Specification:
Length: about 280
């Protein structure tokens, strides 16, 4: 007795899981479109105006993520807004024989990523003499990556800062350097275990006594976390941070989808067993 009902319940569990998987497939594609807008905006040929327009599109996509999380439903229950929790499906003839389907919030606010930030200790100064600036980029768990810039000896502080920041970016070792006038700030990806910055320090030596000085270095990268709702690609720094947050958000949806896939197989097994009974 109860086998017909247990089988229907199981099949509803499958349908709910499929309903969630179809919604989350939409969300992943929206994040991919956001990630492409962010890579486009990071490009240094863009004016501020063009980055403002690309951010307008990202804002549309953020609203699409929130459509999906707020309207995705199975029967009378919302699946993705955080209110779902875990549904217990009664898939046996005895009381309290359950397969659970857990679905977490999947919205612009819940989706997030951790990265690391730092600011130079002070402004780059004018390079009044020609010669080399050495920058040592401290790789967490490896040695230093050493890069160089040649000052002509005529750079303003701002022009000297653009050159130092570009030497750092040209190394492509996981760190972005961004100017605001003569000041430099830094974004690094997380290390392999997610616990610290992939880059732990930036140390400048003004080897050639150019006058640029060494203040734009920093010993300290601190943990940062943004939700997908806080992403803003109207600056190159925001564009590059957004790519980092989006990779994490894609991983989070992927984990939820893999769980929903695996639960579908448990329901399949149970249905087969019930049939055999």
């Amino acid at each position: 007795n109860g086998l017909n009902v247990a089988t229907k319940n199981a099949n509803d569990g499958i349908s709910l899981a499929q309903t969630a998987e179809g919604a989350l497939q939409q969300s992943t594609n929206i994040l991919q479109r956001m990630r492409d807008l962010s890579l486009q905006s990071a490009n240094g040929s863009n004016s501020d105006s063009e980055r403002t327009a690309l951010n307008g599109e990202v804002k549309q996509l953020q609203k699409e993520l929130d459509r999906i999380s707020n309207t995705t439903t199975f029967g009378g229950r919302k699946l993705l807004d955080g209110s779902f929790g875990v549904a217990s499906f009664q898939v046996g003839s005895a009381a309290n024989e359950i397969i659970s389907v857990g679905i977490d919030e999947m919205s612009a606010e819940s989706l997030n990523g951790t990265y690391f930030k730092a600011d130079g200790g002070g402004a780059v100064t004018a390079a009044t003499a020609s010669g080399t600036v050495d920058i040592a980029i401290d790789i967490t768990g490896g040695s230093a990556v050493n890069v160089k810039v040649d000052m002509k000896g005529n750079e303003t502080a701002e022009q000297a800062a653009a050159k130092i920041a570009a030497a750092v970016n040209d190394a492509n070792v996981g760190i972005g350097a961004f100017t605001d006038g003569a000041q430099i700030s830094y974004v690094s990806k997380a290390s392999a275990d997610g616990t610290t910055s992939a880059v732990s320090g930036v140390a400048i030596t003004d080897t050639g006594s150019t006058g640029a000085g060494t203040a734009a270095g920093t010993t300290t990268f601190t943990e940062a976390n943004d939700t997908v709702a806080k992403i803003d690609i109207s600056t190159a720094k925001g564009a590059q941070s957004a790519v980092l947050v989006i990779d994490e958000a894609i991983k989070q949806i992927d984990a939820q989808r893999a769980d929903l896939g695996a639960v579908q197989n448990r329901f399949d097994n149970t249905i087969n067993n019930l049939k055999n009974i």
